[PDB]
Write a protein that binds this DNA or RNA. Structure first.
Lengths: 240, 135, 88, 128, 70, 166, 74
RNA sequence: AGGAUAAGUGCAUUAUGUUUAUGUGGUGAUUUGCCCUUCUGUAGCCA
RNA sequence: CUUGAGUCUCGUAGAGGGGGGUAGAAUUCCAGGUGUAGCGGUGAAAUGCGUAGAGAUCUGGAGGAAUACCGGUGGCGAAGGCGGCCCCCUGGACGAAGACUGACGCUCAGGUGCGAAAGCGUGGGGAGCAAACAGGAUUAGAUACCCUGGUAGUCCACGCCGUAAACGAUGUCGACUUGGAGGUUGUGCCCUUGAGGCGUGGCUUCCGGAGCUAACGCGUUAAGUCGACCGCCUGGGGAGUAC
């Protein structure tokens, strides 16, 4: 178990994120300013994560349909990368609302989506005006890239994995409205209140987004050894 | 009693008055149970602009401690003197009885900013001959 | 302003004669010396209302301490109040 | 707003060099050439061919003022120039370029712009 | 305002747009202001107020990169 | 597309109706806005404002919004166990304990809102803004200041609330 | 590293010493432009302590013509 | 010779971003304003 | 008793109060020298000033308000209030250790005391600007809008009833409630590494959490949680007038 906080004494930083005053309610779990700007360190996140690392164990016991949502300029690859497993679905293009609350319409549009995708990729999408077809193709690709998470997955996910807060406000906004428990990675410009499970950290890169949420940890890997007597008998391969 | 840092400046053509007066002022101060904690003359300088016509003046840092009634009367006398043109006095708190390093800035004045004449002999007669006297 | 040699004379004449400046008699006699000092200023001019706020502070407080004192002991009160003069 | 260009007509000095004084405002420029002993060898201004409104202070009315005065001081037999500048007003640069293009040196462009201490009250009869 | 000394990468015209900052900084930077002793704190002296818009302009440079408009 | 809460009983309390105007920009369209209250019989925080082209499509929209992001809440007997003064956004309403011997006493749409709320015998005077849109918060704020019975002795009454989590 | 105070260039765009006394001239120029005149504290982010005390200390010196006062003395 | 931090080359109209005449009062869109639930209940109003 | 408050020396910030001292430069003027036609004003403009030689410029004198930029969201005063710089006389606040007193506390009907500004009596004083009054420009006009001459006034000091947007816009003062940072400051510590950070206080401001508002907004200086004790309101207009 201890391996997950053996890695937080090893990464955790961003050296600040935004503003001189930052978000006051995360101040306890985090380091204060130095030389006319704001700096953060990995050191102030380990006393918090000495018990709070037990929540990665509760999203791995019921694991089957997980959704990694909220992409950013350096966080996008990390949303793909922690969700690289085959029980775990992900987007690569920015999320927008109604993808969980008007899920009705979205599932009608998925059902359209995989049909026009087999058509476009076989070559069967031709029109005597090539412009009207190639332009529909570019926009179909953006749908595929945006929806790829819920697209191949059996329905509304059993948790919602928000990596970013800073620009991907909506992914957290809709998770509270569907009542689905939240699995959150918060930065020093975001509060740890109003979400059910946290990693204290930063929102970018592989510093907190798969360093506890992968095979290198022990706490996402002892939750999953508790799935093997509840709904399955063997399922530990699927997941990271 | 307390220290009030007088610095004051002198007109060229009038300089010959000061070697007599300063020594009379040192006798007014110590005759009132104060002390002269410095009395360094700095030499002749080019002023940053004219003051009471002519472009050059001669600098003296007197640095008084004295009872408060008398220091107000010497500063007024020195600004209104018939050879000293202006003076400035600063406060006792968050400050020194002996000022900052002007040691270089004095020599520079003597070396290069000087006319070399009678008026600049008087400057040296006004700070580098005594620091306290009874007249 | 108030200085060391006025303050020492007051401790010598009023309250305990050492190491006390805080007690009711001597506290009143230290305030007296600043009221006198303010009346020293008020012998140059009389449009001094922004300072008068302060004069009335030092009086109002003498009223507070004279009240306390006369409720503790009528001796310290009647002595103090006459030995520090003021009014016709 | 131009001084005598023709010879023998008025008193000459012919000292090879002078100083010019530029008073730059948002409503005019006064460009006035003087002797190094301190006596006027000619002037012009930016209403010297009738600019009025904003156009009276702009680089182009500042330039033609500098070109009127610079012309005349060649019969007072001056060849070299120095400039004093007074105000953050417009055409303050177009005027320098004009003196140097008139066939003079302009190596020392001496700011001496005066400071009022705001002893006056400016005209108000309004909201601003 | 043209300044006696020259700018960097210099030419024979001196100009204030390169190496001035304190010249006519409250002397004529004023428009019809009358003699006042407390009115400037809210009329004139808008430094807190004006600093915010500049801060907002430095804030938007990060935020365009972060949305990947570049 | 959301979870919803239900009651085994029908509420279709239409409280208000309005129309949307832009007046030059596309001129003025026929659209309506509507406010509709969905209780439970013992209460809900259920309040829904929605909008559409026509009045029927509009109310049914608004009736949907009165049962999503909302949960039911519950109170034993036709009275409230606290004399408290519920305030929500300048519409301020009052309650005091009472008998069963009185039922409702109220008018307009308010008598219909209080019946599902369980606070109709305790119904005391309203003050501040008492037009339809905000008067109807009885069953929301007046059930968030709630008290409800669970004790056998009045002198165990504060002890019994402490041990409910200790 | 302890009690090595001012061992180096630290604080300031340019390290003068004192701010309230004005008797030296060669360590105040650190905070004075070429026009002969005080640095504008808004543009620079001056060290506030040293700037507040230099506002009286430069005027005293100015009135004693140790420094220029106004732009015409450039 | 300290007008030499040399612009800290940190700098950009530098703190009112202003002014050359006006024209009455109300007026469009409905008579079922109705199509989600057992019991504790509802829109003219009901299981 | 100290858990409230008061007081001594030590230190520190600031335009608090009262009274003294002092320099440079734009407008303005005179003089002489040099020198010729526009100058001014503004949205653009005309009235204005000027050939009796204006405008500008060199030299030297005149004079009074005024004093930048530093100066900031700073700081001070009782609130309104205080602004060139300095000292004398003195207040009131800000910090720290040694030391003392030990509810001496809170509020306040009545109350006395007390002015930004102009109004205003006398004394000081007048360069610029200005109600009025004239004239221009504008237009259905043009008293508003905008300018130009031009006076009391502005500008100084006290004095007479102290007017107001006379304010932590929020009574008085105090206790308690996650902070961070700005301005700028006592002081411990730093590479004193740039109005910084950390330690511990300071007023003073941004940002936002628990809680609050109708909204803006407030949020450790509350508009939160409250305390005592006093002030004041009961639709608008007509009326801050009448009486």
């Amino acid at each position: 178990a201890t391996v997950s906080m053996r890695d937080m004494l090893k990464a955790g930083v961003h050296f600040g994120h935004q503003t001189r005053y930052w978000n006051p309610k995360m101040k306890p779990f985090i380091f204060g300013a130095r030389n006319k700007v704001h700096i953060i360190n990995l050191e102030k996140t380990v006393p918090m994560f000495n018990e709070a690392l037990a929540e990665l164990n509760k999203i791995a016991s019921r694991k089957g349909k997980i959704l990694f949502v909220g992409t950013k300029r350096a966080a996008s690859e990390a949303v793909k990368d922690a969700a690289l497993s085959c029980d775990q679905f992900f987007v690569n293009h920015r999320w927008l609302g109604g993808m969980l609350t008007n899920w009705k319409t979205v599932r009608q549009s998925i059902k359209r989506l995989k049909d026009l995708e087999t058509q476009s990729q076989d070559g069967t999408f031709d029109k005597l005006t090539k412009k009207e077809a190639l332009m529909r193709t570019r926009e179909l690709e953006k749908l595929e890239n945006s929806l790829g998470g819920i697209k191949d997955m059996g329905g509304l996910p059993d948790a919602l994995f928000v990596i970013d807060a800073d620009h991907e406000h909506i992914a957290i906004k809709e998770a509270n409205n569907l009542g689905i428990p939240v699995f959150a990675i918060v930065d020093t410009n975001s509060d740890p209140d109003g979400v059910d499970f946290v990693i204290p950290g930063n929102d970018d890169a592989i510093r907190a987004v798969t360093l506890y949420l992968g095979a290198v940890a022990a706490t996402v890997r002892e939750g999953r050894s508790q799935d093997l007597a509840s709904q399955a008998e063997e399922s530990f391969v699927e997941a990271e | 009693m307390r220290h009030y840092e007088i610095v004051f400046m002198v007109h060229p053509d009038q300089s010959e008055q000061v070697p007599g007066m300063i020594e009379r002022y040192t006798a007014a101060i110590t005759g009132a149970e104060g002390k002269i904690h410095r009395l360094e003359d700095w030499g002749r300088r080019q002023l940053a602009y004219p003051i009471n016509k002519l472009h050059k003046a001669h600098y003296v840092l007197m640095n008084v401690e004295a009872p408060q009634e008398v220091i107000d009367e010497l500063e007024t006398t020195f600004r209104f003197n018939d050879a000293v043109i202006r003076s400035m006095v600063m406060r006792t708190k968050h400050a020194v009885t002996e000022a900052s390093p002007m040691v270089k800035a004095k020599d520079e004045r003597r070396e290069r900013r000087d006319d070399f004449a009678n008026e600049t002999a008087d400057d040296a007669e006004a700070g580098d001959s005594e620091e306290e006297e009874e007249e | 302003s108030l200085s060391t040699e006025a303050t020492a004379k007051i401790v010598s004449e009023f309250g305990r004669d050492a190491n006390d400046t805080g007690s009711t008699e001597v506290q009143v006699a230290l305030l007296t010396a600043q009221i006198n000092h303010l009346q020293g200023h008020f012998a140059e001019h009389k449009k001094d209302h922004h300072s008068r706020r302060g004069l009335l502070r030092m009086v109002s407080q003498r009223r507070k301490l004279l009240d306390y004192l006369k409720r503790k002991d009528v001796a310290r009160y009647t002595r103090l109040i006459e030995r520090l003069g003021l009014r016709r | 707003a131009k001084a005598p260009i023709r010879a023998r007509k008025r008193v000459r000095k012919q000292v090879s060099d002078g100083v010019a004084h530029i008073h730059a405002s948002f409503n005019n420029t006064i460009v006035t050439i003087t002797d190094r002993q301190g006596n006027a060898l000619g002037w012009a201004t930016a209403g010297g061919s009738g600019f009025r409104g904003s156009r009276k202070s702009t680089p182009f009315a500042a330039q033609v003022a500098a070109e009127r005065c610079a012309d005349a001081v060649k019969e007072y037999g001056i060849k070299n120039l120095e400039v004093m500048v007074k105000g953050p007003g417009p055409g303050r640069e177009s005027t320098i370029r004009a003196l140097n293009a008139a066939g003079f040196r302009i190596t020392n462009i001496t700011d001496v712009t005066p400071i009022p201490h705001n002893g006056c009250r400016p005209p108000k009869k309004r909201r601003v | 305002p043209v300044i006696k000394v020259r700018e960097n990468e210099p030419f024979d015209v001196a100009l204030r747009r390169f190496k001035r900052s304190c010249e006519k900084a409250g002397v004529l930077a004023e428009v019809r202001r009358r003699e006042f002793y407390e009115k400037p704190t809210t009329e004139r002296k808008r430094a807190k107020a004006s600093a915010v818009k500049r801060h907002a302009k430095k804030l938007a440079r990060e935020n365009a990169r972060r949305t990947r408009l570049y | 597309a959301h979870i919803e809460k239900q009651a085994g009983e029908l509420q279709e309390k239409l409280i208000a109706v309005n129309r949307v105007s832009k007046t030059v920009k596309g001129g003025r369209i026929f659209s309506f806005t509507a406010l509709t209250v969905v209780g439970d019989g013992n209460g809900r925080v259920g309040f829904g404002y929605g909008k559409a082209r026509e009045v029927p499509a509009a109310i049914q929209k608004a009736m949907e919004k009165a049962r999503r992001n909302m949960i039911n809440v519950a109170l034993n007997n036709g009275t409230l166990q606290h004399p408290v003064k519920g305030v929500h956004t300048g519409s301020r309403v009052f309650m005091q304990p009472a008998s069963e011997g009185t039922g409702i006493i109220a008018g307009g749409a308010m008598r219909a809102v209080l019946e599902v709320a369980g606070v109709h015998n305790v119904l005391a005077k309203a003050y501040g803004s008492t037009n339809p849109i905000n008067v109807v918060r009885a069953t929301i704020d007046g059930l968030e200041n709630m008290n409800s019975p669970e004790m056998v002795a009045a002198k165990r009454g504060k002890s019994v609330e402490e041990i409910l989590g200790k | 590293a302890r009690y090595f105070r001012r061992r180096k260039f630290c604080r300031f765009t340019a390290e003068g010493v004192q701010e309230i006394d004005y008797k030296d001239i060669a360590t105040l120029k650190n905070y004075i432009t070429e026009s002969g005149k005080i640095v504008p504290s808004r543009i620079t982010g001056t060290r506030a302590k040293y700037q507040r005390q230099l506002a009286r200390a430069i005027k005293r010196a100015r009135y004693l013509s140790l420094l220029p006062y106004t732009d015409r003395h450039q």
